[PDB]
Amino acid sequence: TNGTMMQYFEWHLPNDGNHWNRLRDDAANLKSKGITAVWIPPAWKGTSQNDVGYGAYDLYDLGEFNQKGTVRTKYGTRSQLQGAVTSLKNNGIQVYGDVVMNHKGGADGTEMVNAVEVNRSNRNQEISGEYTIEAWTKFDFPGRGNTHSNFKWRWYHFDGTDWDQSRQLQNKIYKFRGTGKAWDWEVDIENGNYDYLMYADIDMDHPEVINELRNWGVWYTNTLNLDGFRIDAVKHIKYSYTRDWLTHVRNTTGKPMFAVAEFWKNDLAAIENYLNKTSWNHSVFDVPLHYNLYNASNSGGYFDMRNILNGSVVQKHPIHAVTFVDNHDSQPGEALESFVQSWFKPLAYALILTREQGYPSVFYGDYYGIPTHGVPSMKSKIDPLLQARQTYAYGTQHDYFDHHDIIGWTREGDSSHPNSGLATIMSDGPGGNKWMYVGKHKAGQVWRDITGNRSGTVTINADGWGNFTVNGGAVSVWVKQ
């Protein structure tokens, strides 16, 4: 069956502690709509209750201990989280947990550390001599104590920080001194070594760090019975470390543990180098395709639809790419904002859901909407597309990316899925028609538009060709009536 995951969260979810409860009660529904895997938001304690989770204070606190002014995380308690995972599991849905290992924020205390300032545009270059700063690198976890783990963090487990409590100076990046201290290598090259990003940067070359995060990885997997991971900020993390961390977890638990890393860079060559350096042992989000979809939706129809897949990861690396329309990085208001316009969104979803290449992901923000930024729920338009993927998107595929506005592709379906086979067509401009081959053995069949956009039927001729139609700025997916 065609796998389909769902990012079950967006950046502006309410801080009401009922998100795990919602996931729990949505499990049965998700299963019926075709979702086979769910990527849950950071389940640990952030810098505050409000934290989306990427602040990453305590990875062993899943809304179980009183820390950072709260017991529950933004999403709920450990109990409520476990209830959600159980619900998904009982409904046959896999669970992918988010993983944040690049840094830690909200240190319990400070430490005086010898450091040097570095060029923020070239972290390889030091711009100050050595001197002592007060850095937030002490993590004792008073609320948790040693429950689950007695590992405590100190300055030497980090490579640097961006804040000196003593001399509160802005626009600074500090690199810690010490034997062997240096920015980790084989990370993105923007700003000449993008090891540092925010908060206290974790030293991926320190032996205790390597062993500890690996131990945490397995504890995390076993505690929540995870089936996979969504790995955060991989371009800022030692490439070989991530590769080996994953292998360690797979080796220890014995589970395949699917994993998709977010290497956020609209650069195919950079992502390909990342896959190479990680020995292709996990997939990556197709960020390049995201920008293609964004640009097409932003072109008022002037985008050349023939090249919508050009430069994407899924075009050259189909089984190592997780395709997506939007996510918390691109939604309205965020730094990397590049939200795919709603008029084009159904087309984008048809692109990633009805084609054979890539592992598609549905964005919670798109499905249930983003109330805070006026983005309406588009499940009514996505549900039919998920239906098409679930029962009709199978078999040999034929592509027709031969027109600047109207493009499409077909699937001949296969014996393993009854009535399977489809023909999606879309136009980022005026509507029209296109003759497409769905298979001679389908001769005589009468197809209909599962999206409901076009109300008539299309009959496949004796040669297996059908003249499919589509409306302006829309998509139609024809299937056996």
Ligand SMILES: [Ca+2]
């Ligand atoms: Ca280092």
Ligand SMILES: [Ca+2]
């Ligand atoms: Ca880093």
Ligand SMILES: [Ca+2]
């Ligand atoms: Ca066009």
Ligand code: NA
């Ligand atoms: Na580092």
